[model samples]
Target chain A: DEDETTALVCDNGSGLVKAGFAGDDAPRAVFPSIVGRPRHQGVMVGMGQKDSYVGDEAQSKRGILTLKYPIEHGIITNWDDMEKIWHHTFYNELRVAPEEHPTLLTEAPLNPKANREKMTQIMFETFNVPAMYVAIQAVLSLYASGRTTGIVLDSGDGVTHNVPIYEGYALPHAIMRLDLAGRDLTDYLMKILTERGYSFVTTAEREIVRDIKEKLCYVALDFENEMATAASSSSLEKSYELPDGQVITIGNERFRCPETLFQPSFIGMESAGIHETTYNSIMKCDIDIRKDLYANNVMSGGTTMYPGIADRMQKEITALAPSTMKIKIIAPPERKYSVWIGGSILASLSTFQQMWITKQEYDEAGPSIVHRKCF
Target chain B: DEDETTALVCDNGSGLVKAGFAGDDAPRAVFPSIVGRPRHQGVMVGMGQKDSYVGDEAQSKRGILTLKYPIEHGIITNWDDMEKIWHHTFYNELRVAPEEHPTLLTEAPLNPKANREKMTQIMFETFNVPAMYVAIQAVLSLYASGRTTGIVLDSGDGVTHNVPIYEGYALPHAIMRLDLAGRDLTDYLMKILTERGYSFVTTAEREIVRDIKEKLCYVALDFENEMATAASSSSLEKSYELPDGQVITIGNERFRCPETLFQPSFIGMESAGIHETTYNSIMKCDIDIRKDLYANNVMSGGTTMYPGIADRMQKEITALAPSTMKIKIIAPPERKYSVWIGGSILASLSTFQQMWITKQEYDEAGPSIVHRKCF
Candidate 1:
């Protein structure tokens, strides 16, 4: 209530872009982070356009030029082409300019020094915000929960990044990240789809992919049990009719998600080394800090919103934590937006104003501020 | 033994090429039907020796340029690139010459007439085989099993084309094809791998996929039960480590194969449809021929090697057949060689010798003989 301004979030995870004002209920708009070409003239390019599907829409455009996700490792590599995608994403939402209001933005923690500087410089020079508070997603999550101390987990597309916040400050040594997340899972899905015969599709076909993930995708807790059941004769005879009417009788024997995270080698990849990462990262924290950390295991992120993410985290982390320590995984109802909401909280905080470096200071000081904060 | 002239059998799917002399113990060579540029050299204009990958070798070429599978949906497109892939496939193997051999190659029963003619022309003109026999995979299966009466399934990478064979000939009325196969399945895998945090791996990844299918993948009999088992809590705790020392945990609560064989609507495409395609195609055959069709359910092609494929087909067909009617799913223990072996047998047949229409016929009849055989 003390002060209010719009916040813009730009996240491109080789899949989607989730951005809006800090206090927005959801993204002002969500589009597949892809571009498209027109076959028929007079067709709108994005969103409810005339037979046009780019991003999510493009998946249906099989046989034409296949659509591509330009972001690599969650960074916009080709921003000029990405500019078109971004323009489409914020067509109506990002209309406001700098002189009119203050702005808050979310950036990945340990953001590349050059990237962070470039982003900050762009926000200040292009949007020309009267005031800009650049905060990392971890810091924003703590701000959102109104918690000064806790471990925040973000399970995005490709990796799960974790950071510990103590008294509103991120403890660099306590940060941990893993290579398991949404993109890898989707890739596994694509493998199954390809093997089962879903090829000859174009970029538009990837949209069908997104739909497949959203509609049919699930996390398996007991892989062996499922695999066993599917392998049984009597059980596999039941015909499965897809969202469409085609029916296949699937057996209960099959693989599941949990098997991949801990023992990913089954899928033929090197283990993510999550165990050591979690253990060592946590141990680096102060012995006293560990106690406070155990009290709140706040898990958030789009991938964390999976049905059993919190339980999985709690189980895995408990094995790594001190035997005597009480470990709990706190899953917010809106886990997907926890980080975004956290940013909203930071945007609202009065003390947060002191934490943010001003553009003028940045122009004079260069990108040293990022090194100062990240280090 | 009476006629020992070298007879060649070729099985070409969108992603693989298997070629060997007829009557050989196994295919002499097989390679993934992919043509990719050497990332380091292909990117440069000239003066560089590029490293390219094909088939089993591709497994190691991940994280590079876009993966290119030249043959899409089982037909040869981009002839020049296809020629390169063919060279890679046959480099150390057969040196085709008109005087050296008589060739029998497999093609999809439902391949477009134009494509069929083009393929027939390519074999005779390019390979310069003295006597060229272009037989549909189904016809070869029928010939190999010595089954005058039986249902034949050709489940390969481009599509699964089923034909009912009786008394030494395939009944056109009883022909059904599903436009999905192993290549499609692999493409789906590529997508899933990407989703799961894998990027730019080559054909070397195919082994992991094979492992996924063999060690972990299963057919679902009862999807609900199967999914529930995969999704159960127990599976999440287990880990399968890869050769690369990466361990992945399977965390799916209930993972179901999007086996679109039964669900075509999921992709929003249509044909006569799978089951109906099977039943309707069979019904077109003479009613008297039906009895012979049920006895030998011979399965050939690369797809038959998928674990439980034969069992699934048998069970599905059993459900559709009369309870009192006897049926069999005659999958060779070595299903992978069925097509090549079958082609070999066809090539060996004295009576079938007249079936081949060589370049001489094409030159004289102007492609009509090829069209007649294919259509």
Candidate 2:
């Protein structure tokens, strides 16, 4: 029944989830990587047999629901919670049944092989999916850009990785990763905000930090100059009002917080800055192809969409490289969902159809076949 | 007179230095990264010259001399002292005039572009060398192994890098770096030793700690298992006698110190374990080439020489990789000087002759020519 069916594309990111039928321009279902069980009575009372929420509905009634993030630090830690989130995305959001369509799932780079095996078992055994393909998130980002070889820097919520893809395959030997990302920046800003006398009664208010970071943050082209001038004047300041109607004014924290990506030592992390990491990543490749990678440096993920980040990254890279080396930074219009879009494009390809691991193959070889069948 | 002369190979390391003629298997001069100026009565006493020492001599009388490390964290920070070290290597040790022999210098991977430019200026203007080629240390290690493309994991004195090379060139975009290496392990051991009632009068005792680490430390294959068994058992412990005849019995510190390399967070540095970083590095590259990279994984540098390191690395890497993937670890007989040997090999090649930045070219293009001529 699933033959020639439009495959489902699901990009499960730590901060956000995007799911849709393959060949769609955008995911039909987009939600947070979270599920909520009601902590108080009378919440989600009329939601049929269950007293739980997913996505925006869950986020809306945050005070009454005990929000449980299924994925932590870029790995799926809770299978049951993840299943609920996936089910909600399929049945409630996309109105699709798992058994009716083949599935293509996007996974973070460096995900443990065991995790994939477990994921394969879940997709085939638990859901009885018709077929499946597990794709590396970085490779998908590269695919979305229509380039087979180049560098993809994905700065998502929990992690930032400098991933280089070569000829439709990810060059795993040269990957550079940073623990600092969107959530880290959010927490950093929260610390600075608290230091400046902002108060939150409950941990649920931390979501306001994420909102503030997304709405107001910008990576300054010249971080030092911005910080210096910002301290002398109020021109760079902004005021964000929380959901509970409390306003907090932010100043130099804007540039200083995002600046951690380029200077992790400033935040006491013993790691090379992201620019150095990118430079080092390029250095690990073939010399002839490095220029192309530098020129086609593709930027993706939600954190990279910050205003002026592309310019800052370009300047930082150019400063550390040969003057003649061309540096270009490109980010898609829908940076947050680029990986899902790539899945859509990939699943729609005639060549990609043969690459999918059919349920029949899984039955013969078991979950271990997923590793051999998919990159 | 020096036409077609053999170039001198100089590998400047943060902990030790190696200098030799091109085509030589071993260096003619080897020394530490430090330079010393005596604080009191001159050790040169009646030699009719100012009293100063470089390398082992500087380290020998560290208490009397004001020791200054020319390099810090793998970068040449003290140019004056570094110049002296070069002078000693050329004049006192190698007994070769700078103006006669062409030079091939090795720099650490991710060395700043300006550092190379400055090195060129020093070589051309100050040393008056006929020609110079500044090579990345990691690239040279690949050359030493006779492989044009592979992954090079160099754990040196100050930093460790997981470098992937393609077609004889270092891929700058995918380099993974770790701040935990030889010196960090030495420091970790020193702290544990101090906590266990060993006394250190001066910071000069760090060298003793370094010696102790090099002699006694080893990476445990199963860290927790080893740690648990070693608690009530003394089989893993060792007794080392210091220069002052004080015998200190080290128990868990031996493996725990080296364990920091694989688990940096054990020492409180926010970094991924070396195994994770290596896995992440491989994940950054094309999946098609990953198997080749893994098969040709080359280990070099002083830090990787620890007993069981290769085995531990193999186990860790294999655990995370697909079951079918094979891992091979290769290291030269003399790991510390592998880069120098590679430089020697490269300088001897007729194909590499055209790649050198000659004095004539430097005179025409200025210091920036190093960037254009070399990577």
Candidate 3:
């Protein structure tokens, strides 16, 4: 029964991962969004030689056409190659072509109307699939939870998106977005490095920095107080261990991460404070819905992986809220893909079949109706 | 008491300028050094300003602090400040800082320093006199050329430096530093300007990307082909023009000043193509110096500018030398007192009150000899 119909899903961005058929144990494949080719053309020469980027073997091949990422900021700008990557991976991983498959996918909250249509068109044209279904991540989350009243929070690569689901769909009153994410934190880290005399060759080579951040970074509750202490302490020296051969050593005198969420101007950002931004996005969701926000709060995204993220998020959310309500930040295992898997579970259900626009509907109604409904 | 005892020289690491009793008639109050600072006590207000930076009124600023040189690539770095402010009525027409003072100025064939100590400290604290010197500018060319050389190649700021000197002083090379001024083309103009996207920001805020190289900027003759192409349409929008209001507009796409010599890693340093590493420092120097095997080419601190500058100078010099000849890049500029400037006229004087303390002389005479010879 499970093999009768299969679906593939991906949430590619600066980060890359591939999943098969709605709810699987975890992603079938996950990798850093990096590719290495060859320095020169030769047999077995690849795109870039591995000087530390990891992911997608096709991209890592020798003498292959120079390869790079397709999606940035969680959206695919270069669909042609990205589509190829998707198709190649899907066929290879799921062992099926479009004619033998039905696909279900989860998209970023409020995915731009134009981008969705373009993606749909590509999928339909490339694969002779009889049926395809796409839905916002929140609807899938609501379906998995079996509770239409709960909130689905998605903190992604460059922004934290939240949506309140009611009945079987995202409630108009609960949609919210904020401009705070992993990249801002990365930028802040860069400024700190410069102030300490470290110069990065390029933002394009940020995987090195991201690796350092992932290992050495942390979040401080009281930013200024923590920074003052960090400035004088040698903890930064031990916070993250460098790879075996790095010539430079990052230390307290030169590196920073946590302070950016509180004070972004150090790196020259103009966005709202991380806490304020999060609160704002949450508050913008329907007023009445946000009232029970404390009980049903869910935090999902790569950023939520930090040890103190849940506690810190709860503190900030509660501090901003009126005293009458209590706040909670629910954590999910595998923070980055909770929503994707949630969507997968929903797509796997028999009842979920009705939610999909039938192949007949797509053929008869044309792309316009699909566009209007999805957009 | 102040009569002729004080000399005021300012430079961008390009043309030499010495104003005072030792002053010249053409331009004699400036040269280029690679460095930068704030216009006010701005760095003080902002958190995390570094201590390595020093220049009059520079450390006091609040934004991104940087280093620049007026004679970058033999071009002026602070041309706007020159045309509009520094060389205008306030300083030149008004003579805010008096001339007719005893002075000695220095210039570089190729910089191996950041222009901080070699260019700045020498002018500021040489005699402990009540005089202040600023980086990024000077009015020394006219006086230096008119009195002694009659011709000088003032290739500083944004283009070529020139002068018309005679005998040992030779005529100043006419080729301006062009848009090839070091900081202008490399460091300052290439840095971030997103916050100050407005044209006036470069002028008002005076971004470092402009001043760093513009003042202490220079050119590399070795890669004349590459440099020429980069300075024109032959290469990707390689050449740059200062926008009417924009102080810095670095073309990170396909242009660079350092690429004139070799390599194109600096995305921000879209300057006239030139080799910037120290190994190329000698190669970047004037052709006349290239053949001088016996000459002791001074490798000064700060003023040398560019990272890995010294190594590049040595390599460039080695490449140009005859098989039997030898060249040495001395580190005395880091420890000596205006030896760079002193080498010109003082070494030329018939009555040599020479402070040339080689290792042998210092060993024979002891520390007391330094005081005796200097006096």
Candidate 4:
């Protein structure tokens, strides 16, 4: 407030985009980073005119218009549609003149060097930003947990990643990504419900199924015991009324679906669970830093917001982790926005102000300057 | 001789579509079940008229035209584009008259009742076929293996399924689906190459990477040992040339990548491998049928065509299977078109003629007749 202007802290995930100014407690705007247009756009020109929709509006028009995620698997492949979402985010969502604010954007782990350069070019040349700093999600997540080092277990809609950090630096070699996450759980529920003769055939109905997952789904304390008992029991059955007035019931599937996170083999995937992946990631880090990494094990993402996940993760990891190490599972209340909050906190600092690549510097060194200036 | 016409047999996979007349040794035409058109089609309409392309033509125009798989994960979601692909298949590819002969189609495991009905409607109303049979792919694959009872381990572009068939009937509960297959392997190579600073970013380039997989990829005879030794060695390095003039070399990733099929946990999928899933599916069958299921573990689809996959599968499954039972993997030379070949065999049979639902039957019973007719 003394000299440096408010920086825009934006976290663009594979599923959602969170945005707000630096120094905020939480993001001012959160929306799906999806774009939509007429299904038959070319033919629509002959019949009627239509405009592309992004974020919340796009989601609302899903059944009518064809929807597409601009950011797929946490990387921007649809540059044109991605810019449309970013454009809407600036003018409509955040209501900001992007040129005036320095953006502290969160980038996915393993995002290519050329990608960061392209992002830099867009920020400077297209958005006309004063400065920008693109930070890896895991490190920023650690920052939100009040630590510079830790193992961040970030699970989103399409995928999950375990990234180990030391002094705000992500160890690329140590990071592990899981193919299963929230969408799998949602689909898991959808499949079970569909088998029971519920109609969730359309993509729009899938969104409803996801809502059901968020409301009724949870991890079990003892998954095996729960499954053994629930095999023929309906005592645990819970029902939810859909927006379309149909009531869907959930029983064993509620806890069983999330089991894929810990025991993914149930789905026929030959991979480690969330806790196992985290332990594996931590082991890849320096032995000396293991203690710190163990102490600050943090959750960051909506997928980690499941009620009993922390308890389940702690118990499971506790069984596998070294006894000498003090393993901790930090479930921050603000985890859903940890990466964004971390960016908010980091971008506000005077040190962070100096770190931001100014447009002037970008003019001289160009997009490649991002490689030299930012980690 | 019976006054019978050759029926069109089509197996539309997520990645590829195989089409030919019944009684044929092999499919006459095979292409990606994708459609492509100008990216900015509406704007292009203003500038110039550009027709939509399908199958081989669409794949050829991939980079220039926005390519989209009409059949997603073995299901037709885009009716318009699906029709376009079928249109090309009938006219340009197979050069067939839909009215002349019956059609035999393959359906995915757990394909919804309504979907079959819709397919029935399409075949009867649009294609105007004399008769049609929407047979389950698992059963068709089993039929192709020369056995009515076996675990058909069909791994396609997007998913793998191990279905246990008992006397021409697929045990729905015994079927196991794994969300990993050919596309995952292609992307696995792309990821490794990307990590090694190779630019296989574009979807068009991904097609080239798929070619690399087709030509050079193979299942490791001993995956664990191969990975352990090859970790520090480049003895298995192989190279491929892209159409755009780039030569890329693959090393340890060749074997390690396919290991995901046997050890999916390496990718954090927490799922069983092809061998384990097949065994699991076999175990799900009746105890008395296990011997027969163990004897005829058939491989189908292009994903099964990798060098040494049959040897590797036979070895791995044998380890997990009961010692008393004999495990035989039938890797038919025409495995890539096993389902289609099976349809060809079945549709031409005099007994199968009694099974095909004619337009007369459809007119009387409607689309729901598919449920009562085709298995």
* Model 3: how far residue B116 lies from native, Å: 9.3
Q: Alpha-carbon error at B36 in model 2, in Å?
A: 3.6
**What is the per-residue lDDT of model 1 for residues B1-375, given as tens digits with 9 covering 90 to 100?**
136566777777566678877567677887666666544324456554545555455535554533466666666666666666555555555655444667776777666677777766666677666676666666766656636567766666676777876674665664666776655455444334432344323444554553453344444555457655664446523555666757654333112233444444433345543444555666787876676666676766665666566555566666776787766777777666667777787676566677776656678787656778653
Q: Which docking band does candidate 2 fall into?
A: incorrect
What is every candidate's C-alpha DockQ against the true complex, given to 2 decimals? 0.01, 0.01, 0.03, 0.02
lDDT of 4 by residue, B25-45 (tens): 888888787665555434444
- What's the distance in Å from true for residue A321, model 2? 33
Cα error, residue B201 of model 1, in Å, equals 7.8
Provide the clashing-pair count of each candidate structure: 126, 32, 168, 13
TM-score of each: 0.49, 0.57, 0.54, 0.54
Q: Which candidate's lDDT is highest?
A: 2
Better of 1 and 4 by TM-score: 4
**In candidate 1, what are the lDDT values of residues A1-375, reduced to their tens digit?**
127555555444346666565465655666666665554454455554554334655554544545666655554455556555545555544654444456565555533344555656556665555565655665556655636787777767644666766774556544544556676666665566544555423455444554344433234544456566655555533444444635433333123543565556555554244434455555766666677776666777765666565555566667766587787777778776665556655565566566655556666675546335642
Give the per-residue lDDT of model 4 (tens digit) for A185-292. 777777777656886755566776777777776688778798888767876776778777677777667778888777776665434677677888788656666888
lDDT of 2 by residue, A214-246 (tens): 778768887778867886788878676766576
Q: In model 1, state the lDDT of residue B339.
A: 71
Q: Which ranges of candidate 2 are over 4 A from the true structure? A: A1-375, B1-3, B39-49, B167-171, B201-203
Lowest summed lDDT over 10 consecutive residues: which window, candidate 3 chain B?
B136-145
Every candidate's lDDT: 0.58, 0.74, 0.46, 0.73
lDDT of 2 by residue, B175-281 (tens): 65456567766767767877679865443667666677778876888888988888879997868777776778887777878777887756764345878878887
lDDT of 3 by residue, B172-247 (tens): 2222122334334433343433433623244324543444333333334344464466556533332344535344
